[PDB]
Design an enzyme around this catalytic site. Structure first.
Site, PDB file in Angstrom:
ATOM      1  N   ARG A  29       1.141   1.528  -4.722  1.00 37.84           N
ATOM      2  CA  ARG A  29      -0.244   1.932  -4.909  1.00 37.84           C
ATOM      3  C   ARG A  29      -0.473   2.260  -6.386  1.00 37.84           C
ATOM      4  O   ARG A  29      -1.436   1.799  -7.000  1.00 37.84           O
ATOM      5  N   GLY A  45       0.741  -1.241   0.000  1.00 37.43           N
ATOM      6  CA  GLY A  45       0.000   0.000   0.000  1.00 37.43           C
ATOM      7  C   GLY A  45       0.781   1.309   0.000  1.00 37.43           C
ATOM      8  O   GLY A  45       0.167   2.380  -0.072  1.00 37.43           O
ATOM      9  N   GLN A  46       2.108   1.268   0.089  1.00 39.76           N
ATOM     10  CA  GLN A  46       2.844   2.527   0.006  1.00 39.76           C
ATOM     11  C   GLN A  46       2.777   3.075  -1.425  1.00 39.76           C
ATOM     12  O   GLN A  46       2.528   2.326  -2.369  1.00 39.76           O
ATOM     13  N   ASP A  47       3.006   4.382  -1.557  1.00 38.04           N
ATOM     14  CA  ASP A  47       2.667   5.157  -2.753  1.00 38.04           C
ATOM     15  C   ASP A  47       3.157   4.554  -4.068  1.00 38.04           C
ATOM     16  O   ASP A  47       2.361   4.336  -5.001  1.00 38.04           O
TER      17      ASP A  47
END
Lengths: 91, 159
Positions: B58, B53-55
């Site tokens: 993502r 889920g980190q950018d």
């Protein structure tokens, strides 16, 4: 696939299939049609999805291959970002 | 059954997955990538794609959209600052054509923490009531205990 410019629908099917050989062959077939200069963006999400993190070199090498000859043009499965699907899990 | 599990970083996605696969609570690292695992529940084999889920990551989920039968969206119920951001990510995810008919299961997670928002609160903040085009469900979970996890697998299997 020496040069067959309409075959992109079959390649998508072949690109993910649960059989690693088929995926490799598909991605290979994409490479040979681009090098000659033929149709390739339809596939992109499929192409990108299996291979991404893995240390398993052959698919990774194949995807790595396709990023030096058309990365910029193809955008279905990549789009535009700093850490694209060319390099994000290729860290 | 093919499942895509996403959510912001630190929501508990990998903890959930390996609790389900190993019955164990592992010591996670941030997932730069995915984990993919197969889990058996009641005659269904769920193939779960846990995508970090980190950018940077993502930005990559869209490659895992295609072929997805169901979506697990994990939320950290204790993090109120990022709930809007979760709402924003999830809303445009709902607009994705490859995700068009996929079953939508929200896990409101870390329910074990004293100030965790309730599932009802989360339902209001994520705008879940406004989904009329497909199946949705919200489930309070604690991935460390295992609470709510199989209630999730149950709901999902009834797609």
């Amino acid at each position: 696939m020496d040069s067959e410019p309409p075959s992109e629908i079959s390649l998508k099917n072949d690109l993910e299939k649960g059989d690693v050989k088929s995926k490799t062959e598909a991605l290979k077939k994409v490479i040979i049609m681009i090098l000659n200069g033929e149709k390739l963006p339809g596939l992109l999400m499929t192409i990108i999805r299996f291979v991404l993190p893995l240390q398993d070199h052959t698919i990774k090498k194949l995807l790595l291959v396709f990023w030096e000859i058309v990365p910029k043009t193809t955008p279905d499965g990549r789009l535009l970002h700093e850490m694209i699907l060319v390099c994000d899990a290729y860290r | 059954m093919r499942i895509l599990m996403v959510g912001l970083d630190g929501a508990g996605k990998t903890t959930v997955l390996y609790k389900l696969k190993l019955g164990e609570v592992i010591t996670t690292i941030p997932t730069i990538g995915f984990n993919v695992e197969t889990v058996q529940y009641k005659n269904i084999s769920f193939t779960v794609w846990d995508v970090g889920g980190q950018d940077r990551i993502r930005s990559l989920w869209r490659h895992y959209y295609r072929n997805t039968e169901g979506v697990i969206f994990v939320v950290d119920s204790n993090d109120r600052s990022r709930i809007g951001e979760a709402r924003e990510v999830m809303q445009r995810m709902l607009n994705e054509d490859e995700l068009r008919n996929a079953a939508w299961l929200v896990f409101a997670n870390k329910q074990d923490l004293p100030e965790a928002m309730s599932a009802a609160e989360i339902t209001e903040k994520l705008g879940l009531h406004s989904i009329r085009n497909r199946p949705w469900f919200i489930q309070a979970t604690c991935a460390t205990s295992g609470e709510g996890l199989y209630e999730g697998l149950e709901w999902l299997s009834n797609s």
